[PDB]
């Protein structure tokens, strides 16, 4: 299936590892031009692989919580390419800020998660209009299921779903589609590192995986990326405002199944 | 139907007008004790009518965006009554902060809407546990439908739905239920005043009302209040994490109907 | 909270035990007049308690799968009371008809679960229009969660949610509201017919216990009342968090 | 994007026109082998175009309301191809059976719309297990929005959404994914009253195309959707979920 993404310029936030890295790599494979915005430099191996598929792919160091850096990085991207065709809002962290944590911790969580999705759309949308481009917001099942000690991240991820509907309405006349992908349990190096802090990492991984209905396994970053890149493409030309769950049945299938 | 809310102490934010006022009044009618947190003093007729139903009902002047004022007003409420049985998070404003407004405007919208729902829950929850009390979060259809030039409000209202699920999970063992009510178009004095700024206020009102499937009319504050107060009561003793739409069919019925 | 249901005539299908029984009992407590349509006679204790609350409460023996019996029982209800103010579609059975069962078994499940919700609405709607009455359809979380080995029941319960939206649209200009309640795990005779219990109870997030028929009834009766006067087309989940809260919680 | 559907055998019910036809054609383009089950023979122009893309694609005349024809047509497909990799349940008709119509008309609507989705799954699932294949159920926005005067179709379409969740659960351990696509307004043979309706579609004020429905359906059949199961994908230009008040 030709996604018609050749030479389309797409910014991917947190685009050098995990879900974001898989999205950047998939974009390169579809002959698009991914532009990675991330705090820390990508691995050499990642950059080598990306450049091999798409020599024009770029990486810009960006602290997304710094509004001026978002502004300037988008400006640099437009200066380089003259156009923007997509934005994937993906950077985030489940920072475990519960009800008990208080205002400052809650607001800091909104800065880490929610506020830069808005900032990035704010700076990208004026350019997406010209190309009838697209936005994909990566959210989390926690936006609708809860988790229990993560008010900051939950609030952020839910606001991202709401903003997906809002921006779809706002941009309908410009032909700019806005959709979300909702993962549940996705195996990434960061998740693997977190699991490694447990007494028995293999048992902890198995305990989490056991609850995923389809195959009792984690979703892969590639699985998230395939749906996200489909949504960026005109193959999804009448899909806007939607929340696509790519989660092995985690959110919607009977909790009682084993 | 006996709601068993007699002598139960319930804080209602923005509780002296519109939806909040109707919730306070219904609470008083059920012989609960509403405690109004609002920036401005309620009008005299409101206070008289409230006291007539419930002499112990109180008002505290509170700027909800000031964390210390939330903290101190909750403390004052505990000092006066010795207990807390419910929290209704209701204060908000649709401030029309679009994609083009930028960071400072978007964050200010979060402060006006989202952040004080968290602050109030943060300060109230430790007390609600002792009484196996309840929370109701008043949201907005815009959280799921979008509207188009109100990113700040939409994000806030969607985060409030997500937090409803989150807090329901967090507090399940303590028997504290958390639910949301989602209005669409509700006629209030403030809405009436906004409409009065148009060239032809009556035609504008008609334009909006024509789109509400059930009766082609606005929902009333009392209609919102009756579902909200039901949700505060042990009549809703196995309802938690839910979003109840009270909207005349606005959100879910075929857009094509006249 | 006054529900203003006094003297309102409400048919409750399967209304003499479990969820249906609690709905009838709650209606009687609110001084409404429940009219139980069910295949088998209610037990004496149920009738004693029901009549103590509402002496005019009635039971009519009805095989809901017989269209003629539905028609005639609605007519009999109108002959006795002169009006109809509510319909609660509730009768059903999780009959475990899976993918391997075949057409005939699947269709039989639709007859046992779905088709009489339509038939009852068909015969009741003209009377409900006259009183600007209300419908509540009792569905099941299985409509949205699935379960396994129960295609017939799941299809039926999902169709009932769809019909709730459809009838809400169809009847909006007549002021007849139509809503659904979605239970998950509720202790009833149907349930015991369907250890495994303790295992299932542990999976209900709120209190690790089954929902009570009384809890389902309180929401169902609220939805019949003018306290829900701008609620139509809605699906109210009364399930202790079963459907919507994180599957991983203990 | 390689969908890895090459030589995969997929039955498409009502697969010779409208949405079904577009799904069959897209499958052929992706080098899958669509097998059209439909009441009437497709037109020669369609068959020519289908053969140009996939010479192995076939059509079988099937009255889906006849359980035996379903059984025998599935058997013939397995005899011919040796495998089944996908089922697309799509055949149906909005037959306008309302509250006033009565039992017989309502049940006839269920036969026309709902019952053959079950029948086809019943006969296809053993073969789908063998290939770790997939099912896509095409539903309708009416399942969640209502419409008026169409209880039969609405009930059927809602049951199909429920069955998507049910079969996803039932078949999880066998690696068989089950998903649904929910169109709203799509210009087809089954489909000023028109200008009125198109104006209400938020994205572009125009109907969704069969090609758009097909692109999502075929993606869902493919291993690119390897951890998607039980889901309802709305492909509707924002019809179901965006603010009703927008112009
Ligand atoms: Ca397209
Ligand atoms: Ca109770
Ligand atoms: Ca895959
Ligand atoms: Cl205020
Ligand atoms: Cl503050
Ligand atoms: Cl019965
Ligand atoms: Cl099964
Ligand atoms: Cl056909
Ligand atoms: Cl009708």
Summarize the structure.
4 copies of one chain form a homotetramer. With 258 residues, chain A is α/β, with parallel strands linked by helices.
Task: Describe the overall structure.
The structure is a homotetramer. In chain A, α1 links the parallel β1 and β2 (33-38). A 7-stranded parallel beta sheet of chain A has the order 3-2-1-4-5-6-7, sandwiched between helices. Chain A is 45% helix and 14% strand. Chain A has one domain: NAD(P)-binding Rossmann-like Domain (Rossmann fold, 3-Layer(aba) Sandwich), CATH 3.40.50. The longest helix of chain A has 21 residues, at 151-171. The first copy, chain A, contains 10 helices and 7 strands. The two termini of chain A are 35 Å apart. Chain A is globular, with a radius of gyration of 18 Å. Chain A is an alpha/beta fold. The interface between B and D is medium-sized, with 16 and 16 residues.
Give a count of the beta strands of chain A, DSSP E runs of length 2 or more. Answer: 7
Structural class call of chain A reads alpha/beta
What would CATH call the architecture of chain A? 3-Layer(aba) Sandwich
CATH class of chain A: Alpha Beta
Percentage of residues in DSSP E strands of chain A: 5-15%
Ligand inventory reads: calcium ion, chloride ion
CATH superfamily of chain A: NAD(P)-binding Rossmann-like Domain
Largest sheet of chain A: 7 strands, parallel
The CATH topology annotation of chain A reads as: Rossmann fold
User: What's the number of structural domains of chain A?
Assistant: 1
Q: What fraction, in percent, of the residue positions of chain A are helical? A: 40-55%
PDB class: oxidoreductase
Keywords: putative sugar dehydrogenase, enzyme function initiative, EFI, Structural Genomics, oxidoreductase
Assembly: tetrameric
Entry title: Crystal structure of a short chain dehydrogenase homolog (target efi-505321) from burkholderia multivorans, unliganded structure
């Amino acid at each position: 299936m030709d996604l018609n993404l050749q030479d389309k310029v797409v910014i991917v936030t947190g685009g050098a590892s995990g879900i974001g890295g898989a999205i950047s790599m998939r974009l390169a494979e579809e002959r698009a031009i991914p532009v990675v915005f991330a705090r820390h430099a990508p691995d050499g191996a990642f950059l080598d692989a990306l450049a091999q598929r798409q020599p024009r792919a770029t990486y810009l160091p960006v602290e997304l919580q710094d509004d001026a850096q978002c502004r300037d990085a988008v400006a640099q991207t437009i200066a380089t390419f003259g156009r923007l065709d997509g934005l994937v809002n993906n950077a985030g962290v489940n920072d475990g800020i519960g009800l008990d944590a208080g205002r400052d911790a809650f607001v800091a969580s909104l800065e880490r998660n929610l506020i830069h999705y808005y900032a990035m759309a704010h700076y990208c949308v004026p350019h997406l209009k010209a190309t009838r481009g697209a936005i994909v917001n990566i959210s989390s099942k926690t936006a609708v299921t809860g988790q229990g000690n993560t008010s900051g991240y939950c609030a952020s991820k839910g606001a991202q779903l709401a903003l997906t509907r809002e921006w779809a309405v706002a941009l309908r006349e410009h032909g700019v589609r806005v959709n979300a992908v909702i993962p549940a349990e996705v195996m990434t190096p960061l998740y693997r590192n977190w699991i490694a802090t447990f007494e028995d990492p293999e048992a902890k991984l198995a305990e989490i995986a056991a609850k995923v209905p389809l195959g009792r396994r984690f979703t892969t970053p590639d699985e998230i990326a395939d749906t996200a890149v489909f949504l960026l493409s005109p193959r999804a030309s009448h899909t806007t405002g939607e929340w696509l769950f790519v989660d092995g049945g985690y959110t919607h299938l009977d909790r009682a199944l084993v």
